[PDB]
Design a binder for this molecule. Structure first.
Ligand SMILES: [Cl-]
Ligand SMILES: [Cl-]
Length: 65
């Protein structure tokens, strides 16, 4: 719900502001169980692609071999 959406987006914005924070956040998201499909629901924007770096980094974290 609203609390979760806002909290996940705030963490995404922290990665946007500081690329080096990504693994701190992705570790947390993995422990929280978020899938890549699900993540998208927290990365909506009026700006096309705004959080693509966040999405892409989590795909690498989860799915890169
Ligand atoms: Cl919630
Ligand atoms: Cl960027």
């Amino acid at each position: 719900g609203p609390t979760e959406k806002a909290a996940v987006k705030k963490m995404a914005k922290a990665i946007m502001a500081d690329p080096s924070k990504a693994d701190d956040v992705y570790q947390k998201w993995a422990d929280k169980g978020y899938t890549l499909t699900q993540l998208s629901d927290f990365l909506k924007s009026k700006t096309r692609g705004k959080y693509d770096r966040v999405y892409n980094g989590y795909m690498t974290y989860r799915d890169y071999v």
